[PDB]
Structure 1
Amino acid sequence: TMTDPIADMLTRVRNANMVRHEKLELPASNIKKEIAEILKSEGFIKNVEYVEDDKQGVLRLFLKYGQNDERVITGLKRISKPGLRVYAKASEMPKVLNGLGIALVSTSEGVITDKEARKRNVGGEIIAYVW
């Protein structure tokens, strides 16, 4: 059955980006919403909407394509997984694409990007890479 909702969400984003879809509806959760908001703030997606419907709720992402229809999101990679979880210290926080990408991290100070983790001098579970 389903075993990694974060991975499912990232894979939904990847598949929609490949097909050059505009929007994306997925079941919602707090961690997913925080990931989507981080993506919007960083500029990888155009917009995020939350539908507080019955059951679980829904997250509606709107993807962003540059000029010439170029895709802003090159790739997403789940790093920590149910089968093997990865954590990193502040001094060992990884740089995605030499800094051109973000690493979404989950920290005691909320889920943030690797830049914020390094700035605040914290570590945590490296949720994902996005470049």
Structure 2
Amino acid sequence: TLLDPLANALSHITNSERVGKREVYIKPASKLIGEVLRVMQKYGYIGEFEFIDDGRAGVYRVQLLGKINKAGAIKPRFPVKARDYERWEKRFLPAFEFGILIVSTSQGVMSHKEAREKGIGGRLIAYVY
């Protein structure tokens, strides 16, 4: 049954855009989904999006640009110390400043490049590149 409406979202995006689609409808829509999309757009990976309500959890219209290689979800959601990012970067991304590693810090959701500035940690949730 439905256990993770975030993994479904990122895998559906990566299946769609790999074949050529220009729009997707993320069916169940948390505020955590939208909070990922907010920072997955700022770096230049998707177009623009809005929330279409239908009396049951709403949906998400997101239109692609054909500019991502692979997205997914770090599932066990390990915690990371503030000085120990590179160790996890050498497992997911393919170069020294490639992609982003979305972290759920104590002050919102933000890419690790903005966590190492303020020096904080938090559970990992997903990764895009």
TM-score band, normalised by shorter chain: 0.7 to 0.9
TM-score (norm 2): 0.87
Give structure 1 stretches of 5+ with no counterpart: 66-71
Q: TM-score, normalised by structure 1?
A: 0.86
Aligned to 1:50: 51
Match of 1:100 in 2: 98
- State whether structure 2 residue 107 is matched by structure 1 residue 109: yes
Partner letter of residue 115 of structure 1? K
Mapping of 1:18-57 within 5 angstroms?
A: 18-26=18-26, 27-57=28-58
Q: Determine the C-alpha separation between the residues in 2 that align with 1:75 and 1:43.
A: 14
Deviations 1:31-76 (A, max 9, x none): 00011111111111112211233110111111113xxxxxx10111
Detail structure 1 runs of 4+ shifted over 6 Å in the superposition: none
Aligned residues with identical type, % of pairs: 35
The higher-RCO structure (CA 8 Å, 6+ apart) is 2
Deviation at 1:17, TM superposition (A): 1.2
Partner of 1:75: 70
- In 1, are the aligned partners of 2:103 and 2:123 still within 8 Å (CA)? yes
Are the equivalent residues in 1 in contact too, given 2:77–2:125 (CA < 8 A)?
no
Figure out how many residues of one structure are paired with residues of the other and give that number: 122
**Aligned-pair distance for 1:125?**
1.1
Post-superposition Cα deviations, 1:91-130, rounded to whole Å, max 9, x if no partner, equal 1124433212001111111011111111121111111111
Equivalent position SS for 1:103: strand
Shift of 1:85: 2.9
- Kept in 2, the 8 Å contact 1:36–1:61? The answer is no
Structure 2: gaps of 5 or more residues:
none
Report the residue type matching 2:73 in the other structure.
R
* CA root-mean-square deviation: 1.3
Provide the residue aligned with 1:86 in structure 2. 78
